Amino acid sequence: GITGTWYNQLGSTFIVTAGADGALTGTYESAVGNAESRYVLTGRYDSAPATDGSGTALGWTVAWKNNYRNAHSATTWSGQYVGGAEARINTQWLLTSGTTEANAWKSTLVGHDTFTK
Amino acid sequence: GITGTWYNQLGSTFIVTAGADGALTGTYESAVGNAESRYVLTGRYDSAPATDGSGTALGWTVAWKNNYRNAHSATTWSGQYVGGAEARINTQWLLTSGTTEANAWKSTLVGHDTFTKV
Amino acid sequence: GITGTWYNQLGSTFIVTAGADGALTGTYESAVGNAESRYVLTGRYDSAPATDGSGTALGWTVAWKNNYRNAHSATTWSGQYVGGAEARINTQWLLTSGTTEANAWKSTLVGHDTFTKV
Amino acid sequence: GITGTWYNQLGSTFIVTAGADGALTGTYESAVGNAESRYVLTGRYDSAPATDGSGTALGWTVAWKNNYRNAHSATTWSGQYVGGAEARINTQWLLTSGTTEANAWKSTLVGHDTFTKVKP
Ligand SMILES: O=C(CCCC[C@@H]1SC[C@@H]2NC(=O)N[C@@H]21)N[C@H]1CCNC1
Ligand SMILES: O=C(CCCC[C@@H]1SC[C@@H]2NC(=O)N[C@@H]21)N[C@H]1CCNC1
Ligand SMILES: O=C(CCCC[C@@H]1SC[C@@H]2NC(=O)N[C@@H]21)N[C@H]1CCNC1
Ligand SMILES: O=C(CCCC[C@@H]1SC[C@@H]2NC(=O)N[C@@H]21)N[C@H]1CCNC1
């Protein structure tokens, strides 16, 4: 289902395991921005979704610090997994940078990523 | 720092531990919405933030399923921690509900929560 | 290049005139939500872009009140026009509802619409 | 209620007239960013709001081009006009900059501005 290796429209790689506890754990590697190699991710998903054809709600976070690079920023992806032959995770995301109070107004980027296996 | 009990403008309770590894673990209790009692949260923060009077970038997720209730939804908060006399976690959030294809355009609420120590 | 009829992925119809002064005027007809028939839109665009190699930044508003229906809400679309063979208006939107204080946390939906000429 | 001079938490000045036609027209001056002096705005508001205590939905745009400067960007504010302790407009906004399609992931800032009629 959710567990596996996903790619988005940028060619970023999202490697995730969906725990029985409703946890998401894995690694993110962004094709773009102030990022190199893998970053830890953690998140949550609805481990008992509706059976009415509705998607499975989920979210995860990456802080853009690893052993190579610190971009003083975090992204959260909020979305739903859509099952089937052509499984999809459809997300919107918020990317917050650590800023001074003067620059807080421009701290947060927003966008949308769709993942496929 | 980040570890401890935070309150937002809705009166919601955010209980978090900030691990040396950059992990956030804890519970969330929403004063509003399709929610009761505490929910598991997990997240990440910049464990080596800039020391320039910049905020500390962080985010976390709550899937709105616990032993009482399932709201078939998930919120992510993305924001920054500011220390000092007036400690704040300033966030914007995305709440996505599980929807049919037809209803996906209205799947996602957006808002902002400001968390304080008192 | 902006002036004319545009269609998004929901099948909504966006009819706009881009004035030489940076104005956007026209009508919006939503294929979804609490809406029927056309609604007035107004907005603004960058009428002096630096390069065709960057999108043309623009935005517009619909208040969801016309002679038929009032959905006590307003959408803003913020995005960029991309010209040429496969012309597109790539947007993110915020749909705010008039809410009681109690419901204000859930006042705003967010999404993304891609407009094409076909 | 909406017609007047407003200021947000950054000290930006929002000057707006709410027309009989549901139109918003006026000027915006940002305290921050790649902006100097006034910019045109246009938008729309709900001219027949609910009578149940609900706020009044509205939205406006500014393209960041005037006679001084061009930041090749536009902001939309989506929000509601309310009462409370005083007259308020609560908004969330999207600020889109001209980018390549490939770099659109970094095109759009998002935030929230609260306006009152108090000079900062
Ligand atoms: O550039 C960064 C860190 C890298 C962010 C990459 C983003 S996450 C959302 C989108 N999807 C994806 O797959 N890649 C992109 N942070 C910057 C922000 C401003 N200063 C640090
Ligand atoms: O209503 C829910 C579940 C509860 C969401 C509470 C939200 S998270 C963002 C904000 N901050 C806070 O402290 N509380 C609120 N899920 C669905 C049901 C229908 N609407 C969303
Ligand atoms: O449902 C409404 C009014 C109609 C909104 C339609 C939205 S605008 C964004 C998206 N793109 C498009 O083409 N159509 C849709 N207002 C309601 C919604 C929740 N309460 C107020
Ligand atoms: O910097 C700019 C143009 C100015 C934007 C000011 C923003 S609108 C939202 C917020 N509220 C307010 O009152 N002021 C700020 N454009 C830049 C963005 C990236 N490159 C062009």
Residue numbers in the entry:
A (entry chain AAA): 16 to 132
B (entry chain BBB), C (entry chain DDD): 16 to 133
D (entry chain CCC): 16 to 135
From the paper:
Tetrameric streptavidin (T-Sav) has been popularly used, engineered and evolved for hosting reactions that are mediated by biotin-appended chemical catalysts. We have recently reported an organocatalytic 1,4 conjugate addition of nitromethane to cinnamaldehydes within a protein environment through adaptation of the streptavidin–biotin technology. In this system, biotin was covalently modified with pyrrolidine groups, resulting in ligands 1 and 2 which differ by one stereocenter. Here, we performed mechanistic investigations on how a protein host affects iminium catalysis.
In each T-Sav, there are four biotin-binding sites whose arrangement locates the catalyzed reactions at the interface of two subunits which has a C2 symmetry. Altogether, this suggests that Ser112 helps in positioning the intermediate for nucleophilic addition at the Cβ position, improving both the regio- and enantioselectivities of the reaction. In contrast, the conversion and stereoselectivity were mildly improved when the T-rSav-L124W variant was used as a host, indicating the importance of placing a bulky and hydrophobic residue at this position (entry 23). The Lys121 residues in both T-Sav subunits (namely SavA and SavB, see below) are also in close proximity to the reacting centers. In contrast, substituting Lys121 with methionine or arginine does not affect the performance of the reaction, implying that the size of the sidechain, rather than its electrostatic properties, is responsible for the observed selectivity (entries 25 and 26). Our mutational, crystallographic and mechanistic studies have indicated that the protein environment corresponding to the subunit interface of T-Sav is critical for catalysis by biotinylated secondary amines. This microenvironment controls the reaction conversion, regioselectivity (1,4- over 1,2-addition) and stereoselectivity (S vs. R).
